[PDB]
Each structure stands twice: as structure tokens, then as C-alpha cells.
């Protein structure tokens, strides 16, 4: 909660509250509701609520609420960092240190920049306390004058009759992680007498940089094509052929899940078999597994590649610009095409009732330098992306049925998406083992769990 | 990189080095070198130096490192940010501020908290002024008295007669993310008169919680079981008929690409037929894909559960500890188990080069709690881990043959692992297509490329 109302100290302090801006703030009171129904306004566009509760019998949803609050705070404790701690900065401290930017990798050593204790010169003495949790102290050398105690120790202090020799002795001081963890902060003291500053020394690996090989634009290198059939082999067929019409090299993987399942194959084609029904997301999970080059190309197995499917492009967008993921458009035989832009925001509800997921179509601003190409939160299933960052986010498994958007939301903030209008498939012109609406109750009680949801709108 | 030379502002001050200390800092000169070679002494153990260059013709080698570096420059530019940066505070000034744990999401608005001016009284005016580069400042309600210049706009001026109404004023100043980005940061100015302060405000989602419902321990629900096989179908059955014996329900995915696939199947079993010879870390990054349940189980297809394999204690180990990965013990019919737990670190290497890997055994220390377990890098191919890390990481499907380290190098610094002793697997007392040599030179060029390596030693 934004606490508005003052300290003791200021009450005496008349303020008249914008509205306008208090508004902006986060009230954790968010609730899902439907547009007024009847006959749509024009410009207007209709709101429709989900409560995620209605998808479990009051009784297990008192469960659910309790497991989900546990499962959450659980999740909290393995992810929360001291880096995250909120520290404010004293005012009129002689001390200066850093205050970001100070890392080092378990296990190992640095000199901390930017110590220093900036008093009155003449004092007769200088003394500064360093003190660590996860590491220890020393000094890369020792200045003649300058008096260390608790070298190699959590705690150093350095006392000195010379302000100048304490600075110089302070610019060769080192900090050594002394337990190993994968990635934590030490929140360390440094002080002098009536004065306290607290810093954070992150303590973590370097990234894996995951670079792949280029081995201009190598598609058949760059790229492999990923898909998933149930079914539908004259569809799959008939976008494997006018891919080839393209892209004669470029690697199609095919994950199918159909009961008697036809042979699919041709060069560069890889087809693998799963168990009859185990789902939509799974077979994108497993197609997906199998990417070996720095990009994959979503596509539908009832797609088709014209002369407007240029990759290129999209290879482009993916090679220019910090983008992890950028969909192409959609086109009926109708001649209309769609790159489903999609906004998810989530929206912090009251506490324990869990979240408010809102989607709404549209995009956040134009993608500077590529016209026709936006930022947006989702787009449709035609897309190009890091195979890496897909591969990151997932198609969770569980949903094996009916699901799109979960993909996105599933990669919220996560995923850098973009959406390119002039990249352009078309799509071409019994088929669900079981109650729809039971998959359907399914995923509103998994999308409750699993995001923290009470409820959400789609517009 | 270590610069322990003075400024000129204190050249006159002497200095003796520390020997001891200079030797723990990165001096980015690592190199890898063998144990001399002859028959190995008792206490000694026999290092194993590879140089990853050797793998390629020099030039083959040229061009792999000039688009390795080109592609590791942009690796830096999509994943370096503003709160990465070295900021110092600086000393004796009357500016308070937040130094860390500030963070809003895109496009979202909080108060920033600990603004404030604490400058003596008895002054005629009092005035700060607030930078932004991503945001824009407003305040939650205004101060009689105090004058506010560039509401709404990325500056913003704060004037005041008195400074108690200035310090009221900017315990309600609000920051605003104004363009959409999925994590970074925007570096802040906060200065007055002579003074300048600089803090870094996080603009970020939260991370997707990833909740699991529970379902002691339900090990149907929390576990799968995942396995790949090729043409060792005894072996396979004889597992999947040993795991049946203590674990009736738990779910087995099995990756198979065996040219000519027998029937394995039965009740919560799942086969995923691969074309022939896909490979290692495919098949295990397939079986991954397709696991629904909070927690993995990795077996290889020729390993036999025994009374002493008993995952409710892994499973324990992952519940109670920030553990990702806990590996058990493969036993021989010898009757001798293993853990192969190991250590592996990459050290910095020459400008250009690319760094050093070390795996040697060992461990880092044991885990609190849990007698016979510890905390490392890498162990054996018995392991349960939980899937989202597990996906998180990935079996890069290059590595169609011979790998087992490179999982756990990949996940290196982000998968926290652990192995205990005490649970045991058995191993039982037609191989790939194509060329050993080819594949291993295949795979050091793939590691040369992808973790920036020069060389590794293994020990
Ligand atoms: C663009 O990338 C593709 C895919 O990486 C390159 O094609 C691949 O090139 C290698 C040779 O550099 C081919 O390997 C050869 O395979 C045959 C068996 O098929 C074997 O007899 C040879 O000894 C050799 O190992 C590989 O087959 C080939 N893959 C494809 C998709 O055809 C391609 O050269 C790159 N450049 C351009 C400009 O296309
Ligand atoms: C431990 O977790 C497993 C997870 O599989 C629990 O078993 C599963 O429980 C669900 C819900 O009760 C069963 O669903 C039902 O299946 C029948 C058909 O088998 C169907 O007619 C119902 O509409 C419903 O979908 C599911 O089959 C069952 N899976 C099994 C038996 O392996 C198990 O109950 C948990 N154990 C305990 C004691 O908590
Ligand atoms: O098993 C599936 C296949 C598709 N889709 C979604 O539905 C869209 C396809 O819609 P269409 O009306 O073309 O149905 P189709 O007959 O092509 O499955 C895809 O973009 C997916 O986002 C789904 O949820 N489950
Ligand atoms: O195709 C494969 C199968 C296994 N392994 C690795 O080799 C070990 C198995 O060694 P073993 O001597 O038991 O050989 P196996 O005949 O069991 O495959 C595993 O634990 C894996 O890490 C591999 O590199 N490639
Ligand atoms: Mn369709
Ligand atoms: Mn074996």
C-alpha cells in the first residue's frame, strides 16, 4: 500500500492530493468486469470478465487460495535477493562508496572501487569499519602509517594518523566471497565514527552467452521451421511443400500426437511421434526441444508459404534490434490478415485473492527503423524467435488442448516481443478427445495456480 | 585490469604489495596445462589439458573467432543494463536518496520512497531538482508553499521558502515509466545547489511465480520420470520394471530414436519416437519437454531401481532446500556407487581469446541439514531436478553423442546443485552411428563457440 499520510513530524504540513496522480498508484484492489452487455457501441469494444474461482467447487477453492498463498511464498524466499532490499542513502556521511555495480563471482576477488572517507583534514586519528556477511576483507597493500585489523576477516577496520594514507589505503581494498552460491548479494557496512552506509556487492556467474554460430542470411543455418499436426496430414503436407518452394534446406520439425500416425518425410523434414492426445503445447514443447539453430519459425501445420513468407525479414528484425520474439501476419483466403497484436498486463489484486490478468489488442509503440513493426506483448502463431528464449519460457505441457496467449503470458516481461505486418502466410481455407469444457475448467484452475490469478478480461 | 597504480594525488604515499592478495584477483591470463605425463605418483592426480582451438583448421579458427566475438558484443548490448553501471556516492552532501531496491513496471507508478534535502535551516529559498530518462515525475499531492516546475515531464523542479515543505513535498513525488521495455533500468538525477546524487529506479514484471499444486509426498504428482534409450530395450524394460515396483504410477516419458522402434508401453508410460540418430542431448531435451510435474527425474535406460532408490528423499532435498538439481548414487554390480560430483569454473582469459575451463572433482561444502549431502556443480546421470530450471538450462541437442558435463556447464552459476550419497540407483552390468572423433571435435568447436572457451583442463 502508498502511504500518503504524514509523520508526526510533518502533520503540521497542509497537502491537498491530486487525484490524478494517486490514481496511478498501485491499490491492490483490482477486480475483473464485464462491458455492460446488449448490443455493442461502435469505437467501443467489448470487455468480457473470467473468474478464475468459478473453476473449482468453494471448497477446494478455500484450499487452492491456501496451497497457492504457500506454493507463493515459498517462491518468494528462493528468489528474493539482498540486491533488492530497500537502502536509503544517509545525507552529510564523509563517506563515499559505490552503491551499484560492484560484482564478483563466488569464490573469487575484487578490489572495491570508489571507497573513500572524504573528513576534515587534521584530525589526529582516521578510522573506517568495513563489515561483510557472505565475504571477506583484505588489502591488495598495505600503506606505511595506515593500521589494519581482521585482514582476511568479515570485519576490517583500518585506523590511521594520516587522512590521505587511509584514502590510499582504502582504493586496495578487497572483498573475497567465501561461501559458494550461485547468485546472492552481501549487503556490507562501511563506517566511521556517528556514520553508517550500506552497500550491496552482488555475488554471482556471468551469464551463458549461448552464442551460436552464423556458420548474409544463412536461413537454412539460422533457422528451423517448428511445427505440430494432429490429423492433418494434407494440411502439413501442403505446407511442407510450399515451404521447399522457398526454402529448399531449411530443417521442418514436426511433432504429432495423432493416433495411427502417417509417415512424414522428405530431406530436411523430422517428424516425431507422441503419445496419442498428450496435447497442443506439449508437441510445441517438443518441436521446439529439437532446435538446434539460433532461431525458430512458429507455424501451423494448415499454413501456407507464399512469396510474402520472406524469413529474411524477419531473421533481420531478430538480428538488428533487441526483439526475442517477432510474428509475421496471418492472411485468410479472404484476402484478410491478422497479426493478432496482443496487450497482457497483470494487475495486483487484494491480498491473497491472487492477480488480474488484462488482454486487450493493440501494441505499445512503433519499432523505430523496421515501418509496419511494432512492440506488443503477443501476436499470432506466426512468429520467429531466439529458439533460446522460447525454449526459456516454454509451451507448458499441461496444455494440452485449447491455448494461445498462455505462451505470452507465460513469458511476460520475460520475452521481448514485436510484430511485422509485411511478413505475411497464409492460412489455408473427430479433431478433441473429450469435454472441451473440462479442459477448459482445467486450464482456469492451472492458470489460477500457476500465475497467481483470481480473474482476468479479454477485449 | 587491475590498475593498483596511484593517482598523482597520492604517488608520494609508499605502498608494499601483497603478494598474497595481487594473486587472488582476476588477471584475465588463464591458460590450461597437462600433468607431465608418465606413470601417476599416489597423491597426485592427472590433469588434462584440451586446447578448442586445436579443433579447427586456422582458418576455420580466424573466422570462428571473429564472429564469436561479434556475436558475444551483442550478446553484452541485449543483456547489460543501466543498473549495472558503477555509481559512487558521493560524500557530504545533503541529499538523501534510495541506492537500491527501488523498481516500478513498465509503464506503471510508484512513490519513490527516502527523498529528501537535509540542509540546515535558516536559508531563504530551498530547491532540488529530479532528472528522469525513461520516466516522468509527478507528485501524489502539493505542498502550500512549495513550487513545482515540469509535472508530467522527465524534469522536475522543486522550490520552497521553507524547507520542512520542501521534504514533505518529496515524500510524494511519484516516478512514472513511459515507454514500454521488459527489464531495464533508468538512471535518476537528484541534485540542488553544488550538489548531485545518482540512483538507478528498476523498471521490470515481476518474475513469472511458476506455482505447482502439492497434490507426505505425492510422488505421482510431483515427479516424472524421464529416460532416453537407444536399442537397449532390455535394459529398458528391466527399469521400467524395476521403477514399477516401488513407484506404480509415476509417469515414465522415454525419448527413443532407435531406427527400428519396438512397442514400450503399459500403464504411465509415454514413448516419443525420434528420427534415427537425432541424438543424446535431444532425446533427454525431448523426454524434459514433455514432463507436467514440478519435479524431473532423470535416469539413464540402463540403471535399475533398487529399495535404496528412494525419491521421496530427493524430493525431500528440493522441498526443504533453494537446491535445483539433487543428484544420487549409481551403483556398480562391483557394488561400488558414485556421485561424480564435480566442480567446474570458468577463468578469465587474454582479450580476444576466450576463457579457461577447470572441472575437477569435488564438492563446495555440505548441505546443512542433510547428512551425506553436498553442494557442487555437476554429478552423475542420476538426478531429480526441478523441470523449470531443468527446461531453463536445456540439453542443447548439438550434443547428438557423447556429453554429460555440458548440461551441468551450461546450467553453471544458474542451477543450484546439490548431490546426497544415500540414494541409490543400480546400473546394469548398437552403439551411435558415425564417427567418435568427428562428433568430439564437432563438440569442441561447438564449446570453443558457444561458453567463449580457449581451452579446458579436466582432473
Ligand atoms: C548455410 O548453412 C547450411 C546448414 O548449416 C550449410 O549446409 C551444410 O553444409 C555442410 C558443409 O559445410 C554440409 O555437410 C556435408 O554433408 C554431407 C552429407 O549431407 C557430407 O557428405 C559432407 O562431408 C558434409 O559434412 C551439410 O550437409 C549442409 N546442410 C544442408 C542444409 O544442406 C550451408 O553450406 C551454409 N551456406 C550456404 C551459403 O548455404
Ligand atoms: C497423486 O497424484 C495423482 C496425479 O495423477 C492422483 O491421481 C489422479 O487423480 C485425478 C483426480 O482425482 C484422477 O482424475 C480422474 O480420473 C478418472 C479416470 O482415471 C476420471 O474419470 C475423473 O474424471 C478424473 O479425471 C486421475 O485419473 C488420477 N491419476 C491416477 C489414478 O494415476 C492421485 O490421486 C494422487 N494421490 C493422492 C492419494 O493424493
Ligand atoms: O490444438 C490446437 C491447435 C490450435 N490452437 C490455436 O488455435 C489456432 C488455430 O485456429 P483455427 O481456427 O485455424 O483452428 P485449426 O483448425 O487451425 O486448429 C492456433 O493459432 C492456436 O493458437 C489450439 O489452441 N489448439
Ligand atoms: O548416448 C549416450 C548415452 C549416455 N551417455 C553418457 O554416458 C554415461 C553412460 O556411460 P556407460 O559407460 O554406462 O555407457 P552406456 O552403455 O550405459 O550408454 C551416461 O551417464 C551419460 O552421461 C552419452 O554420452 N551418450
Ligand atoms: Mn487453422
Ligand atoms: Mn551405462
Not at 478455500?62 to 537502502?87: C, I, K, V
Not at 572524504?118 to 578510522?127: D, F, H, I, K, R
Not at 507455424?299 to 510474428?327: H, I, K, S
Request: hydrophobic share 40%; proline share 6%.
Amino acid at each position: 500500500l502508498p502511504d500518503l499520510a504524514p509523520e508526526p513530524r510533518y502533520a503540521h504540513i497542509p497537502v491537498r492530493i491530486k487525484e490524478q496522480v494517486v490514481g496511478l498508484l498501485a491499490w491492490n484492489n483490482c477486480s475483473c468486469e464485464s462491458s455492460g452487455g446488449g448490443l455493442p457501441l461502435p469505437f467501443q469494444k467489448q470487455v468480457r470478465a473470467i473468474d478464475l474461482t468459478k473453476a473449482f467447487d468453494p471448497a477446494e477453492l478455500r484450499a487452492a487460495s491456501a496451497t497457492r498463498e504457500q506454493e507463493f511464498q515459498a517462491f518468494l524466499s528462493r528468489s528474493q535477493s539482498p540486491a533488492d532490499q530497500l537502502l536509503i542513502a544517509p545525507a552529510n556521511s564523509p563517506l563515499q562508496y559505490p552503491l551499484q555495480g560492484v560484482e564478483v563471482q563466488p569464490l573469487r576477488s575484487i578490489l572495491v572501487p570508489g571507497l573513500s572517507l572524504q573528513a576534515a583534514s587534521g584530525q589526529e586519528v582516521y578510522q573506517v569499519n568495513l563489515t561483510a556477511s557472505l565475504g571477506t576483507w583484505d588489502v591488495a597493500g598495505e600503506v606505511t602509517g595506515v593500521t589494519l585489523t581482521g585482514e582476511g576477516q568479515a570485519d576490517l577496520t583500518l585506523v590511521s594518523p594520516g587522512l590521505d594514507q587511509l584514502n590510499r589505503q582504502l582504493q586496495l581494498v578487497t572483498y573475497s566471497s567465501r561461501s559458494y552460491q550461485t547468485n546472492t548479494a552481501d549487503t556490507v557496512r562501511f563506517s566511521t565514527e556517528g556514520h553508517e552506509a550500506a552497500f550491496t556487492i552482488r555475488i554471482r556467474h556471468p551469464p551463458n552467452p549461448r552464442l551460436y554460430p552464423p556458420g548474409q542470411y544463412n536461413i537454412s543455418a539460422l533457422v528451423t521451421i517448428a511445427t505440430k499436426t494432429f490429423l492433418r496430414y494434407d494440411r502439413l503436407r501442403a505446407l511442407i511443400t510450399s515451404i521447399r518452394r522457398f526454402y529448399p534446406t531449411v530443417t521442418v520439425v514436426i511433432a504429432d500426437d495423432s493416433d495411427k500416425p502417417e509417415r512424414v518425410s522428405g530431406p530436411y523434414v523430422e517428424h516425431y511421434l507422441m503419445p496419442f492426445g498428450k496435447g497442443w503445447f506439449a508437441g510445441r514443447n517438443l518441436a521446439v526441444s529439437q532446435v538446434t539453430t539460433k532461431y525458430v519459425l512458429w507455424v501451423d501445420d494448415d499454413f501456407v508459404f507464399t512469396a510474402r513468407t520472406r524469413l529474411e525479414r524477419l531473421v533481420d528484425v531478430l538480428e538488428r534490434t533487441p526483439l526475442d520474439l517477432v510474428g509475421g501476419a496471418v492472411r485468410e483466403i479472404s484476402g484478410f490478415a491478422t497479426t493478432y497484436r496482443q496487450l497482457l498486463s497483470v494487475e495486483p489484486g487484494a491480498p491473497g485473492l491472487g492477480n488480474c490478468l488484462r488482454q486487450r489488442r493493440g501494441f505499445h509503440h512503433e519499432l523505430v527503423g523496421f515501418p509496419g513493426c511494432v512492440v506488443t506483448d503477443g501476436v499470432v502463431n506466426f512468429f520467429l524467435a531466439r529458439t533460446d528464449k522460447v525454449r526459456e519460457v516454454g509451451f507448458d505441457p499441461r496444455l494440452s488442448r485449447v491455448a494461445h496467449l498462455e505462451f505470452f503470458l507465460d513469458g511476460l516481461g520475460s520475452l521481448r516481443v514485436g510484430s511485422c505486418s509485411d511478413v505475411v502466410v497464409d492460412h489455408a481455407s473427430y479433431r478433441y478427445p473429450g469435454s472441451l469444457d473440462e479442459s477448459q475448467m482445467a486450464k482456469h484452475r492451472l492458470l489460477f495456480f500457476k500465475h497467481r490469478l483470481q480473474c482476468m478480461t479479454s477485449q
